[PDB]
């Protein structure tokens with residue numbers, strides 16, 4: 001279980017520091033209620049060869065961009081922010097990192 | 105800046121894993137709010153037991169569990185670790 005502690009100014013945009021190896025793959029999620037037996041919601045979806053923030057689940061004014069992943073600095077009300085890291089597009093083997101924010 | 109991710113069943117007792125290096129002293133706090141500079145309320149001096157430190161598995165409503173780690177007993181040179189809970 002790994003944990004990335006980052007700092008930003010609450011309610012201003014923040015480009016999240018990618019805790020995954022940068023030349024490989026990552027996918028950003030919210031884990032509902034930070035409960036591992038609850039759903040894992042992808043924050044970004046592919047539309048036209050590009051990633052854009054999900055629109056079919058309402059998580060408010062949280063995700064600003066998916067290129068690169070940028071949030072409005074806040075803890076998401078819905079749950080925890082989790083990134084899944086993988087060397088491979090198939091994502092069959094991976095590890096997760098939870099990202100937590102101190103407000104500056 | 106460091107956080108420790110741990111897992112427990114929400115609202116049931118959890119013996120917290122030491123987030124400090126072996127041999128280091130540890131003191132436990134609830135942080136008042138969400139800023140790094142915020143004052144801390146020391147525990148033991150939500151809490152199920154103080155030996156070993158055992159909590160009711162939950163995020164405190166005031167703020168995060170923080171552990172202060174210090175090699176020397178005088179706690180002059182220290183580092184704090186925020187404990188973050190995933191719920192099972």
Ligand code: NA
Nearest residue numbers: 018019020021
């Ligand atoms: Na990285």
Ligand code: NA
Nearest residue numbers: 075079080081
């Ligand atoms: Na969180």
Ligand code: NA
Nearest residue numbers: 090091092093
């Ligand atoms: Na997969």
Ligand code: NA
Nearest residue numbers: 105106183184
């Ligand atoms: Na630290």
